[PDB]
Design a protein around this ligand. Sequence first.
Ligand code: SF4
Ligand code: SF4
Ligand code: SF4
Ligand code: SF4
Ligand code: SF4
Ligand code: SF4
Ligand code: FES
Ligand SMILES: [Ca+2]
Lengths: 576, 145, 169, 905
Amino acid sequence: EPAWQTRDHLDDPVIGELRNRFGPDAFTVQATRTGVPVVWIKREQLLEVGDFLKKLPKPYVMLFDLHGMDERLRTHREGLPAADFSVFYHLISIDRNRDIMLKVALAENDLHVPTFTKLFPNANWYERETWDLFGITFDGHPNLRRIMMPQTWKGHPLRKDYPARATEFSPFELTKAKQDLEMEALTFKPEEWGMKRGTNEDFMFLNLGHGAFRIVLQLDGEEIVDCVPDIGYHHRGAEKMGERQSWHSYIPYTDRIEYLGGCVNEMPYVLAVEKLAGITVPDRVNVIRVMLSELFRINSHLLYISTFIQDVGAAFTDRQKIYDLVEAITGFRMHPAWFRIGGVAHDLPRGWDRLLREFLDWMPKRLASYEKAALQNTILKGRSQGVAAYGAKEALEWGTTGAGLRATGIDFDVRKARPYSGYENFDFEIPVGGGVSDCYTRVMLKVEELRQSLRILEQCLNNMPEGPFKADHPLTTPPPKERTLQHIETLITHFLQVSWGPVMPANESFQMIEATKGINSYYLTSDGSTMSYRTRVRTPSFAHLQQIPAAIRGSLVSDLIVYLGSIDFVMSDVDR
Amino acid sequence: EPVYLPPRYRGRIVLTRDPDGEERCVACNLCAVACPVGCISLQKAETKDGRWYPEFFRINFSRCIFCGLCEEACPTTAIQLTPDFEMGEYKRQDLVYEKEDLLISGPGKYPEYNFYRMAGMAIDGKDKGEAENEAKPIDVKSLLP
Amino acid sequence: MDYTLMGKLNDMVNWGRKNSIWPYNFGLSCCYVEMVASPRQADLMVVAGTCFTKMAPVIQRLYDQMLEPKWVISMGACANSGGMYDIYSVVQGVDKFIPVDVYIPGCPPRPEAYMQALMLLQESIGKERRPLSWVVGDQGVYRANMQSERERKRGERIAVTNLRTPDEI
Amino acid sequence: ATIHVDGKEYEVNGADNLLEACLSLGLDIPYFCWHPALGSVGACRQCAVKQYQNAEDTRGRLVMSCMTPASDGTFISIDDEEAKQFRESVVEWLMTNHPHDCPVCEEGGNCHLQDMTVMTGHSFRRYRFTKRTHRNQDLGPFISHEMNRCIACYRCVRYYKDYADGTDLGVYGAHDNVYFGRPEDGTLESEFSGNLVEICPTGVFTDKTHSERYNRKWDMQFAPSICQQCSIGCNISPGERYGELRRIENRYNGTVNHYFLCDRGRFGYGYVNLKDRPRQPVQRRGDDFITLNAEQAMQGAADILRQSKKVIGIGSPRASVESNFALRELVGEENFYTGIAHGEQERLQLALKVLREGGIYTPALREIESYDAVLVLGEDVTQTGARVALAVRQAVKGKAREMAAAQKVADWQIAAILNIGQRAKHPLFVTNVDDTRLDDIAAWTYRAPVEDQARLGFAIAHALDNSAPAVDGIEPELQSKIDVIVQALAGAKKPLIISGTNAGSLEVIQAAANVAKALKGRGADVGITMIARSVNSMGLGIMGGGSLEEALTELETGRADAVVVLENDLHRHASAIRVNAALAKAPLVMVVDHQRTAIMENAHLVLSAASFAESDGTVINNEGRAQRFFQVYDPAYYDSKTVMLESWRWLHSLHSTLLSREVDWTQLDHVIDAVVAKIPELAGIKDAAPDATFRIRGQKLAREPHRYSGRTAMRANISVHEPRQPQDIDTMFTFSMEGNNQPTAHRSQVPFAWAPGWNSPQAWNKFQDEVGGKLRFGDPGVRLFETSENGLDYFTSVPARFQPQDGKWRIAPYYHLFGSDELSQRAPVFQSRMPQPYIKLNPADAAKLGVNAGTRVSFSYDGNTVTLPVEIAEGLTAGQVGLPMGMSGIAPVLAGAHLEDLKEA
Ligand code: SF4
Ligand code: SF4
Ligand code: SF4
Ligand code: SF4
Ligand code: SF4
Ligand code: SF4
Ligand code: FES
Ligand SMILES: [Ca+2]
């Protein structure tokens, strides 16, 4: 019974609880390769089901994801309710270490769902993105406006009838948008942003400028009364591109989401595609992927910590050494594009042991230097403690994952809770904080994660398995190159995989991983074709950016700047 | 100092030659379709002896993301990404590299592979039965059972 | 050489603009964090990242805030052409709305590619003709039609025969 | 019948085999030797499934699904482990000898062997020994041969020999050296040899014409179009790349031309890529040829047309219905002339009157295969309507099919059927001026002049029905053969009468109508087929107009001083001296054409019209079926200065500029609405294809596959800035990948067949309701007219017998599949295949002239002395001289004409 098998999860106790509560005919269980019980709920029972799951003895406390899907061109929907569109809700029980996906089927003429914001406040931005990209209205939403596209945008780009490729450039629309930027402040209505009490004659409205983004600030003097972060300035159409590229040729796009991560961003996508293909990778592939993911985690953590130290007023050679090793292994520093379906693009180069040994023997003195510069610095400690602090309740209700969630004391790491890529064969600790997640605790947790990633790299170096760097599956893409260049059937397989694409049988797969800034997940729907029917990417920085108004309510602008530096986020991760 | 680059480095793209000196590319168009950006364009041509080669071969380097998917897709190792990164230009039209800007005079990173030594299709210097692991063609009118 | 629309001091002015260049680096996307003054004081704009449609007006506005003479370097496939993002929300190239003087391929380019961009721009200013004052002389700029860097480097590039095999570091 | 595949219950047809039943249900079973059109033979052993004796059976047995009836209560498994292992083993055995050829193989990305290799999941070679090799043969200009890539699936020989009745392809040799080819090098002689390139699942037989300018199937931009090279209207998928027409694939139509084209349609597209085509409007002023853009061409043309007293228009059967109608609206109904001669127009409207007023059902091309007796009167069907000849061969094999059905042999078990029906066949009687290519299967062939062919038809009609007019002067031996024909036709349940306009004789069509009416009066299920000459001969006949002689008279008398010639060279329908003199007399000649013709020298204005690859329109079948063709590519995408518009667009904007002094580049649906409003007989062309607002769940139909490559590079040598995607306002297709080509989409127009896991022409299985049947949501195209309630009367104009008169030589028409049709004989690959210009003679007449075979004789027709070398024709009759119609200098209006001063040069 492999890990990629299609299961309906009828033995999950949440299915029996839902059956005993709402009756056996109130929902439809779908068998998937997501590893999660997927149930189809009536629209009229969605809030009741969400409230019931919120009040279980080990409750489902986190809205992990919420998005839509255009089901109109989907030809393999056997055992599925009739739908033109659908909305899915991914909910996580942390005490249970379980999750459930709820699906609401919608007809094309009635695209409205009850708002989920009364149960989970992060549903606000998730529903704004679903409205923006699919045109699905959420009744009761306070400010249901566009969040990726500008407000003067026609059409919903993630619909199947929307043309993906770039339209013709018009200078006149550019001058019109520049004009709209000219007196945006003069024609600023604080009703189009969800704000209130616009000019008491003491409230000031400003715009501001990890990526560049705007946030409108309502200030009473220097105190923040409300704020609305304006995002979507870095929207690259990555999911729509997932429908326009083959399963193989989408991998560089996985790189450029969360561009400080690289192979870390490759990992959930190729793991989900291997679930769709039914591929179990060999152990050497697992250790190679873990080693590259931990090298890039170290690189991203070092950049984040070095940026935080400089911003407060309390770094390049280490990242250069990591980039040199990654450049030797993959041929590229920043966007390696090196993981593959079934394995990795090449074997490890001869001499990788020497470079990794030189990196690991040179790092612990730098680790002591960073711990002295951060944990033992009083100016950093007095600047960073207590500013924008939240507890477990606020991290659970806002979908906060990564260092902030563990700083609240919730011991939730994906590598330990739901292991992937052979992470269960490594000995490493998960650092957690007290009950308070402020800037100092988050940065301290990132430093401890740096130490643990160095331990994982030491274990990767010490016993690196000998074996194949690609799986023996027929759907390993591409095949091994020497057999491609020598053998006719391997040439045939390579020819068809790199041109039309590999045929993934119709299914749905899911994979969440512990990325450098939180939990990154790929949710892939295959319609039996050589491209993805739906590529949904859940990124931590979207959810972390949504939590900003609920954490610096009543703080100062300098506190907001420190909070922005303390959040490990990048804007490409937010907007994707 | 010159910047050190590892042998796997994904920089400027070249087209290579087989050890006999003929150009390796057979214009099979696998690199172009494997390009996610779609910045390769080529056309198949054929010599009198039947050898496939590219009539033209152009790469839009203003578009190319140096991902190496074409070199991975090449079944003859003709197209190769090389450790060179100094490709800056004054005009964007000059970033379209034709075949005279790509075809170098050597085998590149794969020094000995000859796809035509593997192919059953006959060219000059290799008739039927002279490829690797190929028996000689038995004529259908042979006396042997 | 060809140009597209009393002599020693013109060369001195060109030299003064050549070895004194103040860049305004535009963040945009991953090209910036690879490659790492007010726009009124800066005279070179380096655009390094994707031209998203929501912030193409920002790029055009901060370009119009700069003063004469102004040069543009476009770093990376996104700023050059749109790159791999030929998608609904991306402008296909910086040069769709502002004129570009040097283009740098890569995704991202190396920092040394930026340094080579600086050299290419430096001789580009070094042999260009710009008016001395607003009242004396012809009030037109003359950019030099330089030989392409792929035409100049063609012989040494084609002469390459063997490279190191990819099984090593 | 009820079958259970992998425990899932399905309802199928019990008369089918399990392979076709399971492919129709959407299941995937790999297969090589089976084809929907050829039947099942059980050769390749690829299609193995596991059959169980009942539901409570676990052992099972590997059976061949193509050789197993899908009977009631069947239990099979496709996903059985032993069946999957065996299918992978069969692919492995085919892979042991297969050459390492995929990059340099024209079948790559379009290869069924690649697809079934991947589908079985075989990607690991454990065979380490040598591969057998083969020398290749030269099969002529169209088909390239690579015997290394063969898998010995026997599809080629079964198609070419048991289906198409070709004689020069076969299997040779033995155990594992089995060879598939000709007995020696030479051109493949079948008129339908080009279907090998889709029948062969590998790259053995490949399109040599495509191989010259090769590109892969993902790089092709396809559109659904209609073949323009004769009147049969076979659906095609033209595909282009880099602005030139690359390939013609068969487009499946279960009502017309299901899997097969003829060689003329498949390989005669090369005129589209000619470098002398007009690409811009060009005005002749003195000796100068000024190039104009579209707007000032319309302005100058409208000024000269406004200042002229009478403007006449000359259409063509090449042009679509929309172009001819737009010319008819520009010049008026009273000033519009069809471009064909008076005799051709008389024969065409007589055939139209027979088809839509004779009360006899005219069959579609696919339905021809089900008739029980065939009488072909005057039509060289293999050289003029070739796909009808292939359907006639299927109708002939119907007798063996019935004989095997009488012994309870299943209809897919083709080898048993052919063994039972050894040489028995349904009756075929062909009649021509000489021997035809249907004579191998014909029960009787009548070689006679067209008067005697008509008299034989009239005599058959009189012998069937005594109310039909009698024929006086029939010889006793010819009378005995007439009674043979009458006993065969009267004894058939479904007799079919084929005739057409190519014989050059009105009386032949009248005799065919008499035979069909006589059979209808006896209660038979008789069908009648009329083969027209050109792609839109029937549409031009339905629209109607004056003859070309009347237009030439209007030009010569000076009553018309402006002539607009649409897609017509005018030399195939009238004498070149008269046409040239009449056009030189007119002070304004405007030629709207996509080919460089001879009359463009006299033309004052030349409009660069679009051919079928660059235009949309509607053409009418020889059976009255209205079919839409769609534009394949925008000609201005690569060359920005090309002004190559649709002919209806040119003429509509010219009419707008003539009336209101403003141009109006209209839309196609507006022109079609104008047609159906103004000509009620052509009202059915609205339903041929849906309008440009048609969507599949909101999206358009994609012209190119989803993996289409080179988007930011194919034009980068012209400019690095990617141009705007060319907009299509005329049709529901988009010029990009951003559309729909799903097999389950509710549409009838499929630009190309592709499904995941099925990259070959076998992907047409996914687009059909059942394999080899109709398209899932109906075949495209609509019949314009229904069968009349009442028939015609008997034609009493029985001609006299042919009398050879001294000094005069009756011209007997000889049609060639390669050479007679104008546009295809302009194609450069046809020149090697084209016969040399040979004038045919009886041995008696040649001995009378003192002329041997090969000596050149000169004759004067219409004051033009031309010289051709002599071929001796045994089957011709004395007093007749045979000429190749449609060749260079021999206009098809010479059929039935007489010749003078035939003497040795
Ligand atoms: S490296 Fe990648 S983007 Fe560049 S030409 Fe090759 S496949 Fe295309
Ligand atoms: S993949 Fe290689 S051989 Fe094929 S067309 Fe491209 S460079 Fe040429
Ligand atoms: S060119 Fe590549 S590295 Fe640069 S901004 Fe674009 S995606 Fe990022
Ligand atoms: S016939 Fe098919 S499998 Fe054989 S070389 Fe050609 S593409 Fe490859
Ligand atoms: S030549 Fe083609 S059709 Fe004939 S047996 Fe071989 S693979 Fe089959
Ligand atoms: S029979 Fe006529 S319509 Fe059909 S393919 Fe041949 S030329 Fe074209
Ligand atoms: S398809 Fe049935 S044995 Fe070949
Ligand atoms: Ca059109």
